Amino acid sequence: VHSKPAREQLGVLDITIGLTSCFVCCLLPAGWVLSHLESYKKRE
Amino acid sequence: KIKNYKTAPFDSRFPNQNQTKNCWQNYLDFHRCEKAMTAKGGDVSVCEWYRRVYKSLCPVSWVSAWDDRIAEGTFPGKI
Amino acid sequence: MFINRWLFSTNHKDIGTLYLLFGAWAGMVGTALSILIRAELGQPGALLGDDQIYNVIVTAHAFVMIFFMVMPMMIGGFGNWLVPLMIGAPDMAFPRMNNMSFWLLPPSFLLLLASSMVEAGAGTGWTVYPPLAGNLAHAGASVDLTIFSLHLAGVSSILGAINFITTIINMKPPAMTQYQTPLFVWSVLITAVLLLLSLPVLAAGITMLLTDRNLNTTFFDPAGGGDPILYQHLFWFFGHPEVYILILPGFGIISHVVTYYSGKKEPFGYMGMVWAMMSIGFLGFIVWAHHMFTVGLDVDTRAYFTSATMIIAIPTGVKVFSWLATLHGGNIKWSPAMLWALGFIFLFTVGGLTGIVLSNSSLDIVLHDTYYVVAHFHYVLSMGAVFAIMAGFVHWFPLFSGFTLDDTWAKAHFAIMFVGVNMTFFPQHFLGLSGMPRRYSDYPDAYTTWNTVSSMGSFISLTAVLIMIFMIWEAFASKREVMSVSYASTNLEWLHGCPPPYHTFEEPTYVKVK
Amino acid sequence: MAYPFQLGLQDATSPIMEELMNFHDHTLMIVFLISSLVLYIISLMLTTKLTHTSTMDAQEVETIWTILPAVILIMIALPSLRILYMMDEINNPVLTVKTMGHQWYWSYEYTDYEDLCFDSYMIPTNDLKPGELRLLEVDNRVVLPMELPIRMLISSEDVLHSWAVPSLGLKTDAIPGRLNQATVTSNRPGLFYGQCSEICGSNHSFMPIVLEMVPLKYFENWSASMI
Amino acid sequence: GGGVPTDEEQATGLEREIMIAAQKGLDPYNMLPPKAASGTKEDPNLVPSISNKRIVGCICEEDNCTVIWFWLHKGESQRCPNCGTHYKLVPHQM
Amino acid sequence: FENKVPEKQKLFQEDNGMPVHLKGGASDALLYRATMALTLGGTAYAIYLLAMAAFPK
Amino acid sequence: GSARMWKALTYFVALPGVGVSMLNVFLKSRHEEHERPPFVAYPHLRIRTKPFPWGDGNHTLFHNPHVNPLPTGYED
Amino acid sequence: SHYEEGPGKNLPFSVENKWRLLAMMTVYFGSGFAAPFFIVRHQLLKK
Amino acid sequence: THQTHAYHMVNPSPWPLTGAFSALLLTSGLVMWFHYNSITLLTLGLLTNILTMYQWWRDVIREGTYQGHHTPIVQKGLRYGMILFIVSEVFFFAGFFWAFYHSSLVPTHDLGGCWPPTGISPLNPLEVPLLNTSVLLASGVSITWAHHSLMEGKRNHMNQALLITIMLGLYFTILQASEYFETSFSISDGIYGSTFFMATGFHGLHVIIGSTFLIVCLLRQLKFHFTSKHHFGFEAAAWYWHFVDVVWLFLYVSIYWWGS
Numbered sequence A: 001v002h003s004k005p006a007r008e009q010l011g012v013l014d015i016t017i018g019l020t021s022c023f024v025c026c027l028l029p030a031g032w033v034l035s036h037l038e039s040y041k042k043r044e
Numbered sequence B: 001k002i003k004n005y006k007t008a009p010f011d012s013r014f015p016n017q018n019q020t021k022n023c024w025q026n027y028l029d030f031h032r033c034e035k036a037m038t039a040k041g042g043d044v045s046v047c048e049w050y051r052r053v054y055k056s057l058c059p060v061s062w063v064s065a066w067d068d069r070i071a072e073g074t075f076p077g078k079i
Numbered sequence C: 001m002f003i004n005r006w007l008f009s010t011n012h013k014d015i016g017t018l019y020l021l022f023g024a025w026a027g028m029v030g031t032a033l034s035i036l037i038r039a040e041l042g043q044p045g046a047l048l049g050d051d052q053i054y055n056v057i058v059t060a061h062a063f064v065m066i067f068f069m070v071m072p073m074m075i076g077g078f079g080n081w082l083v084p085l086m087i088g089a090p091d092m093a094f095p096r097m098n099n100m101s102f103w104l105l106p107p108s109f110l111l112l113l114a115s116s117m118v119e120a121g122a123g124t125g126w127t128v129y130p131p132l133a134g135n136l137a138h139a140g141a142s143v144d145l146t147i148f149s150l151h152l153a154g155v156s157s158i159l160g161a162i163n164f165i166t167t168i169i170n171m172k173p174p175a176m177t178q179y180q181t182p183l184f185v186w187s188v189l190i191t192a193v194l195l196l197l198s199l200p201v202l203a204a205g206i207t208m209l210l211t212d213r214n215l216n217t218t219f220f221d222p223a224g225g226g227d228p229i230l231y232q233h234l235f236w237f238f239g240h241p242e243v244y245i246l247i248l249p250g251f252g253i254i255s256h257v258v259t260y261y262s263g264k265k266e267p268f269g270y271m272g273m274v275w276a277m278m279s280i281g282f283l284g285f286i287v288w289a290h291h292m293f294t295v296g297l298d299v300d301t302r303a304y305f306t307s308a309t310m311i312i313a314i315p316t317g318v319k320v321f322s323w324l325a326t327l328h329g330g331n332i333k334w335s336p337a338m339l340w341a342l343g344f345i346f347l348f349t350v351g352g353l354t355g356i357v358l359s360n361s362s363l364d365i366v367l368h369d370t371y372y373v374v375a376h377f378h379y380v381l382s383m384g385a386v387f388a389i390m391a392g393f394v395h396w397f398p399l400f401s402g403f404t405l406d407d408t409w410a411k412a413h414f415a416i417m418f419v420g421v422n423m424t425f426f427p428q429h430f431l432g433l434s435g436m437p438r439r440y441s442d443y444p445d446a447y448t449t450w451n452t453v454s455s456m457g458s459f460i461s462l463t464a465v466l467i468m469i470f471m472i473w474e475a476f477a478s479k480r481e482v483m484s485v486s487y488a489s490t491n492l493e494w495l496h497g498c499p500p501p502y503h504t505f506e507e508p509t510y511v512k513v514k
Numbered sequence D: 001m002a003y004p005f006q007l008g009l010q011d012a013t014s015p016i017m018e019e020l021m022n023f024h025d026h027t028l029m030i031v032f033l034i035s036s037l038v039l040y041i042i043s044l045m046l047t048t049k050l051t052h053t054s055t056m057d058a059q060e061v062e063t064i065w066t067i068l069p070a071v072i073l074i075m076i077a078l079p080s081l082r083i084l085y086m087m088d089e090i091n092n093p094v095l096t097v098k099t100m101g102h103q104w105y106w107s108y109e110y111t112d113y114e115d116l117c118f119d120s121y122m123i124p125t126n127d128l129k130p131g132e133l134r135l136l137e138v139d140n141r142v143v144l145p146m147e148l149p150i151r152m153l154i155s156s157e158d159v160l161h162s163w164a165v166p167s168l169g170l171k172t173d174a175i176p177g178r179l180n181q182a183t184v185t186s187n188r189p190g191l192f193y194g195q196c197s198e199i200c201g202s203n204h205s206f207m208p209i210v211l212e213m214v215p216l217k218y219f220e221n222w223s224a225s226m227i
Numbered sequence E: 001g002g003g004v005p006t007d008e009e010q011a012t013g014l015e016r017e018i019m020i021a022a023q024k025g026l027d028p029y030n031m032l033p034p035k036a037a038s039g040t041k042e043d044p045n046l047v048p049s050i051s052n053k054r055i056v057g058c059i060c061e062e063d064n065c066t067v068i069w070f071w072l073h074k075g076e077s078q079r080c081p082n083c084g085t086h087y088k089l090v091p092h093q094m
Numbered sequence F: 001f002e003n004k005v006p007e008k009q010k011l012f013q014e015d016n017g018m019p020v021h022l023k024g025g026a027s028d029a030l031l032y033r034a035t036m037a038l039t040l041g042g043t044a045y046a047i048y049l050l051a052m053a054a055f056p057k
Numbered sequence G: 001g002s003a004r005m006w007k008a009l010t011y012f013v014a015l016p017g018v019g020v021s022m023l024n025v026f027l028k029s030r031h032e033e034h035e036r037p038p039f040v041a042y043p044h045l046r047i048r049t050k051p052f053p054w055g056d057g058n059h060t061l062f063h064n065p066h067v068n069p070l071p072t073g074y075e076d
Numbered sequence H: 001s002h003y004e005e006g007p008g009k010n011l012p013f014s015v016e017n018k019w020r021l022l023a024m025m026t027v028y029f030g031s032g033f034a035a036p037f038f039i040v041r042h043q044l045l046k047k
Numbered sequence I: 001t002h003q004t005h006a007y008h009m010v011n012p013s014p015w016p017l018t019g020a021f022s023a024l025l026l027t028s029g030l031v032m033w034f035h036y037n038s039i040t041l042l043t044l045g046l047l048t049n050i051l052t053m054y055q056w057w058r059d060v061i062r063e064g065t066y067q068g069h070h071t072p073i074v075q076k077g078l079r080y081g082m083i084l085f086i087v088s089e090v091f092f093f094a095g096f097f098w099a100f101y102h103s104s105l106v107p108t109h110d111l112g113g114c115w116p117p118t119g120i121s122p123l124n125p126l127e128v129p130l131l132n133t134s135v136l137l138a139s140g141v142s143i144t145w146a147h148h149s150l151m152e153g154k155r156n157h158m159n160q161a162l163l164i165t166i167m168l169g170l171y172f173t174i175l176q177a178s179e180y181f182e183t184s185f186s187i188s189d190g191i192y193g194s195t196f197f198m199a200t201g202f203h204g205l206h207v208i209i210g211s212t213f214l215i216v217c218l219l220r221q222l223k224f225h226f227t228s229k230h231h232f233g234f235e236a237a238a239w240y241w242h243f244v245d246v247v248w249l250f251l252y253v254s255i256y257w258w259g260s
Ligand code: HEA
Pocket: C126, C127, C243, C246, C247, C290, C291, C293, C309, C312, C313, C316, C317, C318, C320, C321, C348, C349, C350, C351, C352, C353, C355, C356, C358, C359, C360, C364, C367, C368, C369, C370, C373, C376, C377, C380, C381, C384, C385, D034, D068, D069, D072, D073
């Protein structure tokens, strides 16, 4: 399957932005919950 | 007869491992033994072996529930 | 426009788009549930306190990655895109109940999420085995909401099965017979027949459970004359079909990707391919008690069921050998979907042989519901169905949306996924042989190290998922088009355009006069 | 009883486990045979350079691919059938012990003579005496004598449990209203650890099973002494 | 006499139009497999289309399992790639 | 009970662009509006009730 | 000929058959005045693990006070 | 025709702004990944 | 003239979505009726699903007989889909009969090992189930008479046949409820009571569905919808009611003659 050139080529920064954002943003939920897991456990 | 064993043996009637039917049949024909030989005047202690076999097979909670049902008259068996 | 097209959808392509969205969302939810399980199991002790919530999380993981990921991605999504384009049909037979099955799936997922919200929790496992689901152990609502989600998923899958069988046997071009369609059409046809003759048994079992919980019936209460072994019988007479619905579209799409990227214009042993599909479909019914080897069945019945398990094992071996044969003598192009298919073939092989080792009931008298069976169904499901899903996802994405995928980044996603999931699921062999039973939150010294290694591999799998969704964004941002598609003369779906227009096949295919 | 870095099974106590491990290594030879085969064949299809994309011949080797896995599975399943048949041969039940799985714990009854019943919880991590094991220690061992086949009637009160001892080689699902029959045999005294293998609620991980295997005379000494 | 309505005077629409087509014996809406099985250069297989561009799926050997799908455009009789039987397109606008 | 199907049929092949589910006049439009406002109004009531059950008093 | 045969079977076989079955039940229902069985609190009958979602939770959907005793007895 | 067709325009979302697509994919998959963590902390607060 | 193929292009319809959310409403209403005893959302869900099915089938009639989109190949597809739904429900009731036979062939120790379980005398099969079977068989033969009256072209004869069949079906439903009133024991009463009440109740719901579908087909005929050849509404009526007949024959034979 031959492919035509990217209409909106991504720059080193753009690739970094997407990669870093994806990792950090997706890790945020788990990370924040894991960090405050003890606080949630508190019936308080 | 007056056989004295230590543990209930293998019953060929139920070769499978679902022995709750074995204990159910043992308790049923033990009570059938009681009613039949008390009606006919025979010796009631012949099926003390039947008593020992259902006691050895099925659990104490089950037999206590069944004895209470027999005692105050709500048993689902043919007794 | 948006509400008229997507909320009021009436064509298979947009309905499959919505299937793909819901499947990706469910995959994210289940992935988070999996990292919850492995984060709780990567540490000896109780991270979450009492493991009732742990049972809730394992139940949610099972339900969302089976009844909300793989069925709506393969059976729903890939099939619902493809089989009209494969057989030349313009649309599907019953697009109204197609859209109804779609838009009734998120109510089932909302029932699942609200059941997790309810304080009772779904502490029954993937199976909803009574009297654990009875009123004595779950006096509440969450198990009822899971059963109603089961109802909704069952109705949606039933209507999908009706639509799929109808479109397959009806909208063939009139001169081609039943045995000329591509292999994915056959696989999803056998899948939909399995759905149709399986799902009402599930509906009977779960309605029976509802009436036992709420309407005071005693079908699974031994104090009322009932029997739970009836529920395992019903649930597993549905459960080995569950297996084969989750697996057979995977067979079809892996057969397509190996015959596409091997350079062949024919899959090897296609007539025998269809024979083996129908064989495992027909023996999927009569093998159901291989999950009940420890419940106290008859020895004769155990022998009959393990013998039938070998007889259902043999045509799957025919499938595997035919896959190696259609790989044979071909210029294997190193597309990432081919790598996914090769991983599927090998890891499916090892998982199936693990299943055979299970299928010996003399081994299941000690090996039942340890982590060895967990290794079984994750070797054959968390890489079988999942590896098939990624193979079809990275194969058909230029057809599906119009944007191709970078080969290096796609093989990168495959590489992290492959090594992480192997590190994830190889130690549970040792966990099961050492004897760690299923649904445990905490675990002793002898299982500590292998459980830790599996947790690290699972985090690697999480990193792979992040690479996959970055890859989706990178495709959507680069927006490179398709210059050409090879083997479009053989594959009917690709020749109509990448992506195809909204109304496909306004001109029917001129079938041969012969 | 399991040791860290465990590769195979917990070592055998019963001759049914000895035959089970021999048959397990048989199945391991089959899976390694097939896995090495498919690995090397896959390496052929990766590393080759010649191409055959012609009109294939189909029904020339499929007869071999039908007859070979058939006899593979036949010689797998024939020991399976033989072992499955010898689990329930003509038994001589010298003793009968019944287990009742209760809500996240167990109860045991030796009722053959002088009706004996006791309970079995799990010794907590903070309440462990030094040198013991986590999650496998139990405040009341299950006492059985060696070199005897003893009938074991396994049932449950409330929820489906699963009496599993992978050291001695047993697992039966304890279902309410239905007691299942197993036979315990041993070739070795000592302690063997197992667990409940069926999900049963909020403390499913917290009910293990412990078997201490003692001689006959010490077995009736314990039974007559604990009352 | 008539009682229940009869579809030859009751049904209207696509169903009526193809009943008219059936009773005059020609089908323009691809209910049936086509005709004129002759695929030479001088007499190719005739393919009806309402447009200038239409798929054809050639089963170009008898009892062949896999189909060879390819397009036809308005013009010369394009042939099947893996066999070589010819196909020529006619516009019907119906 | 007379035959008014053929007159009702020609109230369904108007090429005005009005779709088939609203082609019956204004009455089906009001039925559409009422069922569209009350499945959604029911749905918001169900989600609120599930939330009220999930967060007890 | 098929439609005329089915009409004849309906009028001369099916309708007389329903008439005879209705007459059988109607004559039986006039002669039978069933001696309500004595109440026995069998532990496997009248099981209530959860109240019903209607009424008092103790009456069945098709409750009949004359023939259907509660877990405690007849209502009269 | 009645519906606009083309490369990437058949999706229910917009493709033209890569950063906007990143933000909305981020909130979508973040809600998806964060849903069961928020569930389990809800029962941890409740219990 | 835009569509060359003889298949049918469905206009975008909201009622898939609204029926889906009505199923959501029905399930949630059952939840809050079983637990939080609120009738209101259950009634709302029932109204939504009934009304959605009402105008969904109204719209499929509108594209069938008022637009003629039910081309004979689509009619073949409709026949296939209807038969598939019938065999799906055959397997549903087969799972129910599997539950009944799993209870029946091995009577448990709680029941005394005897079927029927002691403490209940089952209703005799001799009078009221014979009346039931006679009603359903008469309804089936009357439907066959009506269908062959469609073959002949006799509108008055098939109207009379359809009113006779609907009278029989409503008679069956009302005396079904009457013997529900006049049975010695209930659904929450024993495994026997549970299983046959569940089976007969699902069958009663199905014969209610069949009776209402007969109402729909009769009212369609009274407005001259059906014709001599394209009468798939009445074809589905005959298929569904024969399914009801054979399921009632199976249930009658099994329950009322095995262990009774
Ligand atoms: C993806 C889903 C999937 C698939 C495909 C399978 C496939 C198989 N499964 Fe499994 N199974 C599950 C999902 C699946 N299973 C789940 C989810 C459970 C437990 C659920 C629960 O406990 O709640 C389970 C449980 C389960 C058990 C119960 C274990 C226990 O708990 O005691 C058993 C044993 O019989 C079993 C057997 C098999 C067999 C024999 C196959 C076979 O179909 C595999 C066939 C594949 C092959 C590749 C065949 C091998 C052939 C070759 C390698 C070719 C060469 C061979 C020769 C030359 C001989 N499965």
